[PDB]
Design an enzyme around this catalytic site. Structure first.
Site, short mmCIF file in Angstrom:
data_model
loop_
_atom_site.label_atom_id
_atom_site.label_comp_id
_atom_site.label_asym_id
_atom_site.label_seq_id
_atom_site.Cartn_x
_atom_site.Cartn_y
_atom_site.Cartn_z
N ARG B 8 0.82 -1.20 0.00
CA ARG B 8 0.19 0.06 -0.07
C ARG B 8 0.80 1.27 -0.20
O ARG B 8 2.11 1.25 0.60
CB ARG B 8 -0.93 0.02 1.23
N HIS B 9 0.55 2.38 -0.53
CA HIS B 9 1.25 3.56 -0.61
C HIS B 9 1.25 4.05 0.97
O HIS B 9 0.71 3.71 1.81
CB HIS B 9 0.19 4.44 -1.38
N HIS B 189 -2.74 0.39 -3.56
CA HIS B 189 -3.80 0.71 -2.51
C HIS B 189 -3.86 -0.19 -1.78
O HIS B 189 -3.29 -1.26 -1.86
CB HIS B 189 -5.22 1.10 -3.69
#
Ligand code: CL
Ligand code: CL
Ligand code: CL
Ligand code: CL
Ligand code: CL
Ligand code: CL
Ligand code: CL
Ligand code: CL
Ligand code: NA
Lengths: 259, 259
Positions: B8-9, B189
């Protein structure tokens, strides 16, 4: 005029994690079990128990400190005189700050017991400090020949005695560096910011505007790496030369939820 | 055996701050007003409106991604094939990851719209992506000659179409690098981790009748820079080679309380 700064330490391991020492130490060997924990831990006379009593910064606490140092550098502000509370978190914050500032390595962290937090009889804490040589071994740029302003025992003190310690050390630091004229920073605890303001206001002749020192003037501690600034003579509270900071939290992922 | 990772970012500016664009832009010029904000913003065709729609990472968000790359480097794990959702936060996470990894400059970020989050009709959003050329000018090591598996438009889509997108891109990436046999990372994401598991289990023949794809399998999103791992063939969900991470929050100091 020159600058005098007060900086609270960065994010603490002990406040970010649970029973981290027994979790991470297998016998006497530390194993990093989270990315926000230290990569390694230096030897100290008090052993891993010393780290329970005297927490390191997290990786983020180092980063918070570096951002402040970088902010000063960007603002074109230099530092020459660096004093830190003997608490490990404060010394490490000083180092992260110096790293971000890209200070010349001849600028040393002077460990000053005068800057240590209140030794409240109602909160007896274990006091365990790493020595200058132990901190240098850890890679911290600590002044090995500095003779502190204040000698402190491990015993509780009254609030009056506490504020006197801080005032002696801060006023002596500012007075002693006046001829040189370089900028000063005090790296310590949440209370250090208020102690700096009180100490430097008290250097003026007229005492009518001066407020008595209080623990608990405010309900909440200033944030990690909160930066306070004064310029003088005469000593006035001013906007620091770099912006404040805010970050959010992020919890710990358990890969086993991916089944 | 080979590694496939999903990440995930890191921490987002838009979720950490309030109206940061109108606050920081003064006459179309960005001014950094917080230490955890970007030092500067690269030019993009959509200008400040583009940044409202397509948030940068915070300083901490870059640092979180770096810690993961560093952790991979410490574990002796290399990466050759790096795919990122076209969201700016994901491409920046990819660069921070590569910075921590000290990857060779030849290891380029492949911007793959197949990896973009679900375009939900209940949640219309402005869509504004920086071009590979704008990203390279921003200093991101993006692959200029990469031809994406999925072409994607600005329109809402059904949940089925969303999962099909992700699976096409992720299976294509895993199939196309098999001969080379290098390690792969999908940087995206919160949902990307579950997409990777679903796409790679579907590449197995051992167990058909796996779990149908679900938005809302879990109540909470995985943490920022949550790292998921698979190894194969055949593809097994395993512990990643580096630890998870946790950090706490820190609020914004207002120096005026000192007066
Ligand atoms: Cl502990
Ligand atoms: Cl032993
Ligand atoms: Cl300097
Ligand atoms: Cl306090
Ligand atoms: Cl905004
Ligand atoms: Cl712009
Ligand atoms: Cl989600
Ligand atoms: Cl397989
Ligand atoms: Na060490």
């Amino acid at each position: 005029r020159r600058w005098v700064f007060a900086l609270r330490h960065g994010e603490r391991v002990d406040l970010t994690y649970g029973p981290w020492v027994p979790h991470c130490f297998e016998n006497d060997t530390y194993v990093r079990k989270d990315l926000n924990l230290p990569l390694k831990l230096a030897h100290r006379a008090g052993g891993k128990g010393g780290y329970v009593k005297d927490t390191p910064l997290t990786r983020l606490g180092w980063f918070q400190a570096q951002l402040v140092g970088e902010g000063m550098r960007m603002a074109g502000v230099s530092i020459k005189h660096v004093y830190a509370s003997p608490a490990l978190r404060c010394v490490e914050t000083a180092q992260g700050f110096l790293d971000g500032l890209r200070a010349d390595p001849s600028v040393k962290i002077k460990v000053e017991p005068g800057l240590f937090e209140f030794k409240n009889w109602h909160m007896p804490k274990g006091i365990d400090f790493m020595t200058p040589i132990e901190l240098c071994k850890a890679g911290l740029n600590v002044d090995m020949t500095y003779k502190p302003y204040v000698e402190m025992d491990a015993s509780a003190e009254t609030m009056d005695e506490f504020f006197k310690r801080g005032e002696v050390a801060m006023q002596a630091a500012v007075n002693d560096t006046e001829k040189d004229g370089g900028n000063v920073i005090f790296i310590g605890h949440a209370i250090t910011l208020d102690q700096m303001v009180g100490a430097l206001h008290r250097l003026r002749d007229d005492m009518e505007d001066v407020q008595p020192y209080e623990i608990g003037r405010n309900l909440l501690k200033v944030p990690y790496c909160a930066l306070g600034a004064m310029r003088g003579k005469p000593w006035d509270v001013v906007s620091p030369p770099c912006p404040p900071s805010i970050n959010s939290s992020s919890g710990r992922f358990d890969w086993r939820i991916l089944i």
